[model samples]
Target: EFSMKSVKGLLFIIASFILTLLTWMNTSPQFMIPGLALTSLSLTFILATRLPLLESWFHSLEKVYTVHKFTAFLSIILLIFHNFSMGGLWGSRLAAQFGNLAIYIFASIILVAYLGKYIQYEAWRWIHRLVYLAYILGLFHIYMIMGNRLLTFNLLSFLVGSYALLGLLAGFYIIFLYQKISFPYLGKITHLKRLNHDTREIQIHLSRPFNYQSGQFAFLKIFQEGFESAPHPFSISGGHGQTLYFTVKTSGDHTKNIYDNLQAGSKVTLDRAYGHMIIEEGRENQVWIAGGIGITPFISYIREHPILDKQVHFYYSFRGDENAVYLDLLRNYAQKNPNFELHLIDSTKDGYLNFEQKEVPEHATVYMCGPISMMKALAKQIKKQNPKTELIYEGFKFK
Candidate 1:
């Protein structure tokens, strides 16, 4: 069935088809293979600019990354195909060598991307930047081979050049200038208080207004000595006016003492909100499910609108008492808000949240934010149970 994910995939297919047809008309059908590869790589670069417009254009920032992932893999597949299917090497020997090197580097980059779970995020990020090097090598290879046709400045060359140049610029911006120009405002840490044993809630007072939607997230780069300089993406928990809030629960040993490294008034640069999980008033019953740290977005929602217009059943589950945040606030709101209902589940005592036990309306809109596995399983259960139900989710994990 046609869905949001399919939109980019379909665009890619159409783009590849157009590239093939144009190359076939200009030269031969076989020449289109490498062009398709370049087109695929170019699209990846264009999608990964991290510009706000891209997030809107792709429907969501998450979808842009999704497209970047698959397009990158497809580019390599096309590169390998272009290698064997093109009969033999006929271009400049140096160009062929650069092409060969780019192929090796592209393969290495893709392998590194897949192994992102094992490697540290900072390490993976540094290695990922090598893609720009690979992209440069790719452009050099294509330029050497097709310098004649490319110089014509016709429709084919113009279209191809525009995308290629746009891609290169995007790559250049991300690698060299993004850190310098991306962050618009600096905020000071007003407080860094521990919510529980593992969870820490951070309060930041921004220098300027940063308006954002509920359920959005931002990348924060803390200036403190012990903390990593690179910004880490965290969900916007709850905030008002110029103050923004973030909740960080220890995920692993590395970030176990994150709160300990912070001091009051530590300056931080915030990459203002990005994400598509927004709450809207609708007729259908809303089922908001949050697991563990995923509760931040829902908290933002309630903080923005103390009482919602539509019927809402929020199921927030955590491992234990120490793992839960905003429990008292949620309880108080539930008591006052007649249309709102809250269900707190301790996984240790109640196992896990199961949709089979809960009641969902026939035309319900299920909003989920949680661990990737839980969301996937629950999504499957919800879809299988009621085909008419809508699922809107943001299980964004840093890769």
Candidate 2:
């Protein structure tokens, strides 16, 4: 059974192959190496644009993230190969220098990217954004080369140059234009409370209701005193209409700031809702899995009452029962809903949920949101048991 997920990945590979082939045709096989490197860098930026269209292309932002890293590293490796293959630069020394600088910046940033667990997300992201500078310098390196054929008014030049320009614009948007675009959708904090020792619940009323489906999410930014002003993405845990709700696990600097100082009257701006892991329309039996704070969108759907008619098997795993978010809400909801089966597993004691023991429904669509490792492991286990099971998941780290 060929799912949409596989097709999306296939499309990405096909697109890359096509671009590389075109570059090879334009010049030589040798030139195509650097050509593909440029194309990959452009794609790395383009994917991170967080555009709604890109979301559909990859099914979710998380998938976009996966490929973003792939292309970034792919380009870096290709640059090294191209650099070595050519045995260093020739025609224009400055152009060569620009490329070298971009490579060094990319190398350092990627090391920081791999060291993400050690640094704060804000610091990591600030330094990571220097890639835009590297990108600009990279473009200068390509276009400024002496007698560069890519500068010519030709079909290949136009196509490739336009794609690279689009990537530049995309980076510009993320770096400079994002906040301006997202700031208009302002919501006022109406209520705030501690859910547990580690999690906090916040309710806000938007100036205008954001039109969104149950599983959609938005980038949140609050600039009040003691707040980390960087925009952070979170699932729309509950509520709809002009009023909205959020559940923040106080594990990150931004989240801890929100937990500590985001007051009732603070103004928080929300970017547009983006996510596709919603309730499947025709799937009569569905299995929904949420691990720890990953319960947000599921809670939204459960609150939206979309699964009242369909049979829902909800599995929630947490490290500690006392610290789990929305535990009582889910329990109460499950008790009233005859078609909903809720499984609460404390992973600290039970050592994670075993699908064979749980007996996942054969024909059901499984939508999971959790830690990336757990999601991957569960996906493999379930897919092995039922090869055709439709599984949708979203995930992350570096708090």
Candidate 3:
């Protein structure tokens, strides 16, 4: 099904394309070039997210991720070219007239957010959503750039005005109708302990409701004012059991709050379950790569469970022992589970994990969650290696 985000994106593409095509139809081709690039950029991302056409061709999750990342950066560049080449205020000129500081700042935030995937998942997540920063910058630019001229046209006025109105309505609908729907969470923080140093494991004990599978995830709403309103989804660290745990490294807003205020009795709201990354279906082998905090879900998967059917291999990438969370637990679990393999990449000690070769099966399914850099580097490495491995990755990011 097509989502509101996809629909809005499509409208944005159509409006931008039509305006540019008509304006530059008889003009120099240089002016139309960036406009064409912007259209392609939008189409790429729109298809990547909404359709499975590319995913059907190859099972590599990295392939889909590449499309996502390239489209994102290319879109930004195309917009930059469009604005600068066109020159002067198309609508006020606040940011551009004042000298593109707003654009600079927004672009910077997006970059940091993009890079944050490798450093800290939480930080990357919070900053990434603020792509609204860029959206606003572009909006302001639009207002000033073509305000005097475009606003005067009845058709352009209706198109732009309708887009804004529909977007606002959709935003409100998602906020009020969609998220208000809740799920049951009868889990309590049964255990809270720091094993290594900065690494902490938060356990939520659940007795009933054993419906959730291993690799599934839930949206977590912390019990606080500002925090409660925005629920962050983390994968099921451990399945629905007597005690369900989330092993997380303290990074940004919610994680810090979870570390600070979390106790044995702390209660959190868990929303709808999503994702289908489970292994017990019929697969024989599972290869999991977790970078830093991305270890939360897999820890719940491979820990303490009897090695019944599937063979599990885990590669943990981190900076050092201090930064490594649950090293001892992972070691102990891997020791008992013969099928499970644990490999750690300590950058401070052994330097960053060089993108090396590995044997991945033709029918093997792979799941990876971690820093974007490691993921990207790993993607390049995987393509160099098997290029046919069935890859399944879960990205919590929307747009």
Candidate 4:
């Protein structure tokens, strides 16, 4: 099927043809080698922009990030080969030095990017953004190799120049204008409360209206004393008006700091919404599985569509005695709404959620979010039991 899951492979195949045609006449190892390198780097930049077309085709930012990672990794490998293959050209004053320097800088960025979990979010972000500099150096190296002459106003030069300009624009947006371009919606925290021992719920009132559907997520940047610049993605718990809500758990340093330090009236910037975990309008019988904090989007659904006519069985899992945020609210909704069925699960007491305990409904569609491993395993078990049942999930990681 021609779906987002297959887009990466298809793109790689297309890139192969593009390289073959572009380098067909210039078969010199030096030319072919650097040509392939540039193609890989160009693809990396294009994918990094997270353009709407790519997002719609790939269906999620997480999948787009996966493809970006692969392209970046491949670019490094191709550049390494290009560097060694062009070792004889090292004596050239501009060709080797600029390219070599770019390689080293990009290598460092890739290292930190892959091991980003260990570093603070703000620092890691700035370091990763340095790839724009490396990219410029790379283009300069290619220009020097092609010849030090000025770019002509011809068809080929125009094509290359336009592509480079697009890359530059994308780079500028990523480094300097990202917040302004993507997160134009300004807001302020109107309320904040500790939902449980570690989770907090916040309400934000946008300066103007910001439209978003239930179950979608957005990137949020809080302007406060300690946390000022970093933007983090959080699921939209519920909202219909200028006021929006988010439920966050103290899982990482950034989140824990927000839980401890955030105050009402703090300014916030919200990026455009992203996600594809929406409920199908006609699907009647639905099974929702939420592991830990993954109950967020489901909460959004219940709040937005209170009088649903179909059967909805929700299974939420928590680790400890501390009930998850919105448990009480969900309970109330389930009690009053005969169409909604809610099940609270404590992993510590009832073991992991057991799909086998209940007979798999062949007609119900399943929506799951939470730990990747748990969701994949449950999806597999459900498919094994009833192959006709359809399953859907939303990715949590941005990079």
The candidate maximizing lDDT is 1
Deviation in Å, model 1, residue 90 alpha carbon: 13
Cα lDDT of model 4 by residue, 349-374, tens digit: 88888785577555888999989889
What lDDT does each candidate get?
0.81, 0.80, 0.59, 0.78
The lDDT, on a scale of 0 to 1, for candidate 2 is 0.80
Please write out the lDDT profile of model 1 over residues 1-399, one tens digit for every residue.
247644755676576658656865676455677777778888788777787776766667766787788788888998988877753544448878788878889999898789767787778889999999998998898888787877785767776687789789989998888777888779999988888888898999998988888888998888876677787788898887788998988886435757566778888898678887777634458999999988989899888888678799999989988789889989988988988989999998998898875668877888899998999888888887888888888865734
Model 2's TM-score against the true structure: 0.89
- Candidate closer to the true structure by lDDT (higher is better), 2 or 3: 2
Question: Residues 1-399, candidate 2, lDDT per residue (tens digit)?
Answer: 234754675587568758667766766665778887888888889887777777777766766787788888898899889878765644357878888888888888888887676677777789999999999988888888735576777766776688789889999998889778846778899999898888888998988877777776778898687777777888887776898888888876677777877799988898888877777453788999989888888888877784488889999999987868787888888888878988889999988877865577768899898988888889989988888888887664312
- In candidate 2, where is summed lDDT lowest over 10 consecutive residues? 1-10
Give the distance in Å from residue 243's predicted Cα in candidate 4 to where it truly belongs.
1.1
Residue-level lDDT tens digits of model 3 in 1-399 = 233424444454466567756654544356465444434443443433322333333232344455556556766677677657766433343646432544455467657856655655555656654544444455565566555643665654554554444444433333344445544665666688774555567777654554566666666665544443466767677745456666656667567766666667666656555554665552687678877777776776665364635777677888787778777778887777777778888877887665465676566767888777777777778767777776655564543
Give the least accurate 10-residue stretch of model 3, judged by summed lDDT. 50-59
Clashes of each: 0, 0, 10, 0
Off by over 4 Å in 1: 1-13, 16-20, 86-92, 281-284
Q: State model 3's lDDT.
A: 0.59
Instruction: Give the Å shift of residue 296 in candidate 2.
Output: 1.9
Check candidate 4 and list the clashing pairs: none
Which is the better candidate, 2 or 3, if ranked by TM-score?
2
